[PDB]
Design a protein around this ligand. Sequence first.
Ligand SMILES: Nc1ncnc2c1ncn2[C@@H]1O[C@H](COP(=O)(O)OP(=O)(O)O)[C@@H](O)[C@H]1O
Ligand SMILES: O=P([O-])([O-])O[C@@H]1[C@@H](O)[C@H](O)[C@@H](O)[C@H](O)[C@@H]1O
Ligand SMILES: [Mg+2]
Length: 273
Amino acid sequence: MKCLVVGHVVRDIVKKGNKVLERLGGGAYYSALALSRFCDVEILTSFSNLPEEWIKELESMAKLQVVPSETTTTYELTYLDGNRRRLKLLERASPIEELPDGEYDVLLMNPVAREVPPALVTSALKKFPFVAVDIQGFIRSSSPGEIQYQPIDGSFLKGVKILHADLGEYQYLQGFSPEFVDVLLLSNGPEPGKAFLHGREYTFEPVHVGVDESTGAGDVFLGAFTGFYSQCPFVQALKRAAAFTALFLKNRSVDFSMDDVNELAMKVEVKRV
Ligand SMILES: Nc1ncnc2c1ncn2[C@@H]1O[C@H](COP(=O)(O)OP(=O)(O)O)[C@@H](O)[C@H]1O
Ligand SMILES: O=P([O-])([O-])O[C@@H]1[C@@H](O)[C@H](O)[C@@H](O)[C@H](O)[C@@H]1O
Ligand SMILES: [Mg+2]
């Protein structure tokens, strides 16, 4: 397979206690990282400058298509536990307005700062047969600071194959019922999550891991699920996505074997109804 992941790569300023570091982040990066274990990935993104080593990391995992920009999207993430976080947008790269006219088995739209208009999802749903979406960058407002949320109508998501939102993000979605999409992944950090298959609800319990931050969790979970769902029954795909994401969080990498994923996935609880 061949997939296109769309959205800004980010200069993350990660703060955990009194400690601060810069690293590569973004929905596009993290979702591509997950999908790189399943397929050839390309990333449609925008940025201005990034460190040579970060550009090498991206180009080792994916072909890059970069919309010119004079700015690079930059977020400060402050972690008070592993999941409870403050996000502050410091800088935003150029919007993404055009899709390539090549042919991909999967288009995954994962913006972080309103860089993908709803209109582009509608274009994508016509020019491509399989579209997956993370909602995060659609419900955030675009201006600098502590992030604000804006509700949106969900009707444009009809036809989306797989959609992911965490619990706090979901409440800003409206004109929306889960059956608008083939699979809704509704996650809640370390706590139990929900998955809907054609609107029928399942619950899942993630693998317990002790982490000082969870940056990229949702992106990896969406990316890995999209990969497993293409080659596993629904439930198994859910379990393997959870396990993969759990391995990513402690390894903060995707440099573990698929056999370990499959072993861990056996222990993930999933219930129907
Ligand atoms: N602290 C954690 N411990 C164990 N698993 C986690 C943790 N945080 C996230 N996960 C896994 O990642 C998935 C998505 O993470 P979540 O934090 O819900 O999304 P987002 O990063 O978009 O907020 C969860 O459903 C869970 O499987
Ligand atoms: O943690 P998560 O929900 O997968 O996604 C995160 C984005 O919401 C955030 O804007 C970005 O700066 C991080 O690098 C990461 O991509
Ligand atoms: Mg998220």
